Write a protein that binds this ligand. Structure first.
Ligand code: K9N
Ligand code: CL
Length: 115
């Protein structure tokens, strides 16, 4: 059902290696709905190439636009299983500290801070 479940560690690693070869300025991001989530829709896809210069505040804006949310729908984004200490950090920096061992950066969204 989830991404890690669909693809072998081997497959996720080789894919990250190809994105490096072909999309060298992009951060390979996995963005998934919380398995409890009722209110927000599922994304049209799972794997995203995020320009390495955008900060987390702008990545939240991007996903809210992708979900076609309105002003007073709530949106919370976990990175590597936990809260973001800051939304102002560039995603290149966030990748280097919060990346998975397979080389993706893993995010999960919900309408409550209680995931
Ligand atoms: C910044 C951002 C968020 S999702 C996105 C598009 N994601 C992709 O799969 C590729 C097409 C070129 C990047 N762009
Ligand atoms: Cl590129």
């Amino acid at each position: 059902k989830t991404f890690k479940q669909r693809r072998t560690f081997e497959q996720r690693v080789e894919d990250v290696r190809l994105i490096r070869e072909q999309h060298p300025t992009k951060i390979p991001v996995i963005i998934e709905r919380y398995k409890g989530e009722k209110q927000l829709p599922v994304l049209d896809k799972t794997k995203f190439l995020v320009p390495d210069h955008v900060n987390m505040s702008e990545l939240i804006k991007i996903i809210r636009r992708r979900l076609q949310l309105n002003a007073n729908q709530a949106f919370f984004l976990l990175v590597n299983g936990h809260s973001m200490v800051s939304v102002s950090t560039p995603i290149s920096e966030v990748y280097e500290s919060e990346k998975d061992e397979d080389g993706f950066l893993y995010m999960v969204y919900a309408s409550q801070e209680t995931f």
